[PDB]
Structure formats: C-alpha cells, structure tokens
Design an enzyme around this catalytic site. Structure first.
Site, PDB file in Angstrom:
ATOM      1  N   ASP A   9       0.958  -1.197   0.192  1.00 40.79           N
ATOM      2  CA  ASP A   9       0.029  -0.022   0.062  1.00 40.79           C
ATOM      3  C   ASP A   9       0.868   1.487   0.048  1.00 40.79           C
ATOM      4  O   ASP A   9       0.322   2.281   0.352  1.00 40.79           O
ATOM      5  CB  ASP A   9      -1.162   0.065   1.185  1.00 40.79           C
ATOM      6  CG  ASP A   9      -1.922  -1.108   1.038  1.00 40.79           C
ATOM      7  OD1 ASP A   9      -2.517  -1.270   0.005  1.00 40.79           O
ATOM      8  OD2 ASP A   9      -2.138  -1.829   1.968  1.00 40.79           O
ATOM      9  N   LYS A  61     -12.049  -4.317  -3.228  1.00 44.28           N
ATOM     10  CA  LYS A  61     -13.156  -4.132  -2.377  1.00 44.28           C
ATOM     11  C   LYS A  61     -14.520  -3.893  -3.059  1.00 44.28           C
ATOM     12  O   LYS A  61     -15.244  -3.167  -3.044  1.00 44.28           O
ATOM     13  CB  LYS A  61     -13.267  -3.283  -1.317  1.00 44.28           C
ATOM     14  CG  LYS A  61     -11.847  -3.187  -0.380  1.00 44.28           C
ATOM     15  CD  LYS A  61     -12.127  -4.484   0.492  1.00 44.28           C
ATOM     16  CE  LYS A  61     -11.280  -4.136   1.851  1.00 44.28           C
ATOM     17  NZ  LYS A  61      -9.686  -4.059   1.630  1.00 44.28           N
ATOM     18  N   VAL A  62     -14.554  -4.768  -4.321  1.00 46.67           N
ATOM     19  CA  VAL A  62     -15.705  -4.360  -5.212  1.00 46.67           C
ATOM     20  C   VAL A  62     -17.230  -4.438  -4.538  1.00 46.67           C
ATOM     21  O   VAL A  62     -17.622  -5.266  -3.862  1.00 46.67           O
ATOM     22  CB  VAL A  62     -15.810  -5.519  -6.341  1.00 46.67           C
ATOM     23  CG1 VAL A  62     -16.360  -5.271  -7.405  1.00 46.67           C
ATOM     24  CG2 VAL A  62     -14.168  -5.486  -6.895  1.00 46.67           C
ATOM     25  N   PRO A  66     -24.386  -5.009 -10.005  1.00 43.84           N
ATOM     26  CA  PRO A  66     -24.025  -5.895 -10.798  1.00 43.84           C
ATOM     27  C   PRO A  66     -23.299  -5.649 -12.255  1.00 43.84           C
ATOM     28  O   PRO A  66     -22.124  -6.086 -12.448  1.00 43.84           O
ATOM     29  CB  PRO A  66     -25.175  -6.964 -10.985  1.00 43.84           C
ATOM     30  CG  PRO A  66     -25.789  -7.019  -9.857  1.00 43.84           C
ATOM     31  CD  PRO A  66     -25.744  -5.339  -9.470  1.00 43.84           C
ATOM     32  N   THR A  68     -21.956  -2.700 -13.003  1.00 48.56           N
ATOM     33  CA  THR A  68     -20.484  -2.038 -12.676  1.00 48.56           C
ATOM     34  C   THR A  68     -19.476  -3.075 -12.218  1.00 48.56           C
ATOM     35  O   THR A  68     -18.182  -2.851 -12.564  1.00 48.56           O
ATOM     36  CB  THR A  68     -20.803  -0.789 -11.880  1.00 48.56           C
ATOM     37  OG1 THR A  68     -21.651   0.229 -12.347  1.00 48.56           O
ATOM     38  CG2 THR A  68     -19.540  -0.221 -11.338  1.00 48.56           C
ATOM     39  N   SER A 116     -11.516  -6.224   9.597  1.00 47.60           N
ATOM     40  CA  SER A 116     -10.653  -6.215  10.501  1.00 47.60           C
ATOM     41  C   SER A 116     -10.774  -5.131  11.258  1.00 47.60           C
ATOM     42  O   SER A 116     -10.195  -5.169  12.581  1.00 47.60           O
ATOM     43  CB  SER A 116      -9.395  -6.473  10.081  1.00 47.60           C
ATOM     44  OG  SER A 116      -8.826  -5.682   9.303  1.00 47.60           O
ATOM     45  N   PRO A 169      -6.144 -10.294   6.858  1.00 50.36           N
ATOM     46  CA  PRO A 169      -5.576  -9.024   7.318  1.00 50.36           C
ATOM     47  C   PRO A 169      -5.804  -8.563   8.675  1.00 50.36           C
ATOM     48  O   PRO A 169      -6.693  -9.287   9.109  1.00 50.36           O
ATOM     49  CB  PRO A 169      -6.095  -8.124   6.265  1.00 50.36           C
ATOM     50  CG  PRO A 169      -7.500  -8.553   6.014  1.00 50.36           C
ATOM     51  CD  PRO A 169      -7.659 -10.086   6.110  1.00 50.36           C
ATOM     52  N   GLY A 172      -0.433  -7.359  12.651  1.00 48.24           N
ATOM     53  CA  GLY A 172       0.788  -6.572  13.068  1.00 48.24           C
ATOM     54  C   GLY A 172       0.196  -5.310  13.438  1.00 48.24           C
ATOM     55  O   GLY A 172      -0.238  -5.113  14.695  1.00 48.24           O
ATOM     56  N   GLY A 175      -3.134  -5.249  15.324  1.00 49.06           N
ATOM     57  CA  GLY A 175      -3.331  -5.906  16.576  1.00 49.06           C
ATOM     58  C   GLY A 175      -3.364  -7.447  16.371  1.00 49.06           C
ATOM     59  O   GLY A 175      -3.279  -8.066  17.348  1.00 49.06           O
TER      60      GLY A 175
HETATM   61  O1  LIG Z   1     -10.861  -6.428   6.718  1.00 48.41           O
HETATM   62  C1  LIG Z   1      -9.867  -6.109   6.048  1.00 48.41           C
HETATM   63  C2  LIG Z   1      -9.922  -6.063   4.579  1.00 48.41           C
HETATM   64  N1  LIG Z   1      -8.787  -5.667   3.798  1.00 48.41           N
HETATM   65  N2  LIG Z   1      -7.768  -5.063   4.710  1.00 48.41           N
HETATM   66  C3  LIG Z   1      -6.648  -4.558   4.001  1.00 48.41           C
HETATM   67  O2  LIG Z   1      -5.450  -5.366   4.087  1.00 48.41           O
HETATM   68  C4  LIG Z   1      -4.175  -4.782   4.350  1.00 48.41           C
HETATM   69  C5  LIG Z   1      -3.761  -4.652   5.682  1.00 48.41           C
HETATM   70  O3  LIG Z   1      -2.633  -3.849   5.816  1.00 48.41           O
HETATM   71  P1  LIG Z   1      -1.885  -3.475   7.307  1.00 48.41           P
HETATM   72  O4  LIG Z   1      -0.959  -5.098   7.682  1.00 48.41           O
HETATM   73  O5  LIG Z   1      -1.043  -2.535   6.902  1.00 48.41           O
HETATM   74  O6  LIG Z   1      -2.919  -3.210   8.418  1.00 48.41           O
HETATM   75  C6  LIG Z   1      -4.618  -3.175   3.736  1.00 48.41           C
HETATM   76  O7  LIG Z   1      -4.133  -3.153   2.512  1.00 48.41           O
HETATM   77  C7  LIG Z   1      -6.168  -3.067   3.942  1.00 48.41           C
HETATM   78  O8  LIG Z   1      -6.945  -2.186   3.096  1.00 48.41           O
HETATM   79  C8  LIG Z   1      -7.790  -5.073   6.257  1.00 48.41           C
HETATM   80  O9  LIG Z   1      -6.775  -4.192   6.825  1.00 48.41           O
HETATM   81  N3  LIG Z   1      -8.731  -5.442   6.788  1.00 48.41           N
END
Ligand SMILES: O=c1cnn([C@@H]2O[C@H](COP(=O)(O)O)[C@@H](O)[C@H]2O)c(=O)[nH]1
Ligand SMILES: O=c1cnn([C@@H]2O[C@H](COP(=O)(O)O)[C@@H](O)[C@H]2O)c(=O)[nH]1
Lengths: 211, 211
Positions: A9, A61-62, A66, A68, A116, A169, A172, A175
């Site tokens: 990112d 994150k679509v 439908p 689009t 998350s 995800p 780190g 948390g």
């Molecule tokens: O529920 C979700 C879905 N996607 N991401 C994505 O996963 C990565 C997590 O990155 P991080 O380790 O820097 O927190 C980022 O690109 C974020 O947009 C989350 O963090 N949580």
C-alpha cells in the site's frame, strides 16, 4: 510462500518496487490495492507480476451494482491480476457478476465476509455469517476474514469448510497475531509491519520465523 | 524458480499429479501441453494452478489462421493458463491474433522461433532468424529456442535482446545440456529426464545442482 502475503500500500512506484524486491524471497503473492493503483496506474499490476514473478491479488473491495462490478472485474483481470477481492454485503447478484467474469477470464474471486477494523462491528459483523453462507451457496472458494478477531475467524472457517482458502488481514499494525491467525487462515496479509519497517526484509523474516 | 520449467507430458492425471507434486519444491512453473490436455481435459490447467500454486504455460504450438488462433487463445486463457506458446511460421497476422487476445485477457504469448528436434533443420531453421525479428517488430517479449543448438540459441538471443525472456526445450532426453543452454536462455524446459526418472525429485535436484 511462507503463508505470507504482502499488502503493498505504498503510494509511489519507486518505494513500492524497492520494498517488494527486498522481501520477494519470503513471498510469492502480493496484494495490490487502490492506494498504489490510483497513484501509479493499473499498469503497475503487470509490472509487478513480471518483475517479481509473483501472483497478484487486486484488493479492490468491489462493492457496486452487478453491471458495474462486471466492468471493474474485466478491467482488473485485463490488467493482469490473478484474483480480486469483492465485498459480499451488496448482495448475491453483485457477487455473482464478479464470479461470472472470473469464470470467463480464468481468474479467481475472494469474498470479503467480515472486516478487521473497529468499525466492522457496526454493521458488517452482524451480517458476516450470512455473507459467508451466501459465498458457499454461490460456489466461492476463496475468502477474507479478520486477524483481529480470531473467534470470528474460527466461526468463518467453520462455515466455509477446510477445503476453502482463507486469507486474513489485520496482522501486526492493527493488532492481529501471525500464529493465532494461522490457526484458522491459510495465509496472513501483512502491510505496514513490513513496508514501514526500517528493514522490511528483517521484518518479514521475523514474522516467518515467529510462525 | 531454479530456472527450471517442468514439461508435464504424462497422459494420465494421477501420474501427472504425482510427479508434479514430487518436484514442486524445485519449480514454480509447469508447461502443460496437448498430451495431458487431450487426455484429461482443459480443466486440468486450473487444477494444477490451484493445487500447486504454479504458473502454467500452455504449450499448444498455436499454428492456425488468425480467426482460429483467436478462438484457441481465448479458450486457453479462460481455462486459466498464464501464457501460451505460439508458432511464428504461419506469419505475422497469426501471431498478432494471439497477442490481441493476450492483451485483452492480461496474459502472455511466447513465440516459438526454431524448434529443437532434428526435423527443425528442414524448414524452420532457415526461417528462424526472420521469425524472431518478426517477433521483435510485433512487440513479443517471450521466446522459445532450442537447447540442442546453442549456437542458434545464441543467434536468437542476439536478435531478441537481453531484456526478452527466453525459455529452451530439448534438455536431457533430446541431447541438450542445462548449463550450456542457460548461457543464453533464462530458463530450461525439462520433461522426460524428470518425469520418466525412477525418482523425479532426485532427477530435478540433480539438474538444479549441475547448474
Ligand atoms: O478487513 C480488512 C480487509 N482488507 N484490509 C486490507 O489489508 C491490508 C492490511 O494492511 P496492514 O497490515 O498495513 O494493516 C490493507 O491493504 C487493508 O486495506 C484490512 O486491513 N482489513
Ligand atoms: O522446439 C521445441 C518446442 N517444444 N518442445 C516441447 O518441450 C518439451 C520437451 O520435453 P523433453 O524434455 O521430454 O524432451 C515437450 O513438451 C515438447 O513438446 C520441444 O521439445 N522442442
């Protein structure tokens, strides 16, 4: 590789290429999202795939209607992505549109069921089990669930079965713990803990050794 | 990985899966051709990609008119292949048709310029330099050249430049040498020396250590 997916990112191409190259020996899958694509262009997907020989998951994150969603998935796969992350909360027709394009193009859809971050508890969590069941009913085989809530990750794993692929995800910075998350997910996604580290390779190596 | 691509030309699914699984730690790219696909179906491509998490090159020696080539490439990429091998001898329009579909689907075309078997000297060799130059003119960045004739592989490398990716079959069974071939190609393709061996993993390990 190492059950570790890099969430790239960073927003500028030079930094993104530098960090990804430094940690390539530890991974074989890179998650590229809008922070990098909207800053450097969709061509960055093919560049990464070629330069690093890694699989690319487009975390878009679509979450549209439908018609689009079909357009977004087609452009994303044309750009070379191996898979795309799609939200399940807009409903089954919106997910099916993504699955139809993935089938046409020989690619994959990952269904995001529960997020998350803290705000995920407001509306998504309450619908998450139903979203996961919808995924199962639609034939989805790849899912995304939260590292920050292993009890929810366990519930999600319960619904999708052991044969489905689950990535997670929130490890780190947010948390989540690598080892605990891997009790339920097949792979962990890690962004900031690696890409903001003084030594991304050392940070990646540390995570891999902790598990 | 290890600059080694497995040519999986066994004809039954069980044997193909067994050998590919045994040598997976040494590779990350599998070349699947018609011997396996015409025996087990196009669905074997997605199965391999998923089960082994490897890249799949479809060695279909595409060699038809433009319109049919477009149809063959579309079906192949829909099946999940990452790249397709196409013959250059049928001409530029036939190659361009393949490149157009690869662009539409975010995939890659490998151009076969000179073949590795004895019969290749009859007609292909005489046209090979011109076929490679045609590839360069069309923007092709991936090529296939013969392990059995390193002087021809050198000439091909000369035409395509150091930035192009060149893979080379004819290693082992056909007489080609791994180390000499890698003086010019980026990766070697090996089929029988590995898949007919009593211990495919030991055979793969031996090749990797010899280079
Ligand atoms: O529920 C979700 C879905 N996607 N991401 C994505 O996963 C990565 C997590 O990155 P991080 O380790 O820097 O927190 C980022 O690109 C974020 O947009 C989350 O963090 N949580
Ligand atoms: O010029 C060429 C082009 N393609 N192949 C293919 O590469 C593989 C080489 O296999 P081998 O190691 O068993 O000879 C086989 O799938 C074969 O069709 C060649 O051998 N030579």
């Amino acid at each position: 590789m190492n059950r570790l997916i890099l969430a790239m990112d960073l927003m500028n191409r030079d930094d993104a290429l530098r960090v990804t190259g430094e940690v390539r020996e530890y991974i074989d899958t890179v998650k590229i999202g809008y922070p990098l694509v909207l800053s450097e262009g969709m061509d960055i997907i093919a560049e990464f795939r070629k330069r690093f020989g890694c699989r690319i998951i487009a975390d878009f994150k679509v979450a549209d209607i439908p018609e689009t969603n079909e357009k977004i998935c087609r452009a994303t796969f044309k750009a070379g992505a191996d898979a795309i992350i799609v939200h399940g909360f807009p409903g089954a027709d919106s997910v099916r549109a993504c699955l139809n394009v993935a089938e046409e193009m020989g690619r994959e859809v990952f269904l995001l069921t529960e997020m998350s971050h803290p705000g995920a508890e407001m509306f998504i969590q309450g619908a998450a089990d139903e979203i996961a069941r919808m995924g199962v009913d639609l034939g989805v085989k790849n899912y995304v669930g939260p590292s920050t809530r292993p009890e929810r990750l366990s519930r999600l794993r319960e619904i999708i079965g052991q044969d489905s692929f689950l990535i997670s995800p929130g490890v780190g910075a947010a948390g989540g713990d690598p080892g605990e998350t891997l009790r339920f997910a097949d792979a962990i996604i890690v962004g900031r803990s690696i890409y903001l580290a003084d030594n991304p390779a050392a940070a990646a190596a540390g995570i891999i050794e902790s598990i």
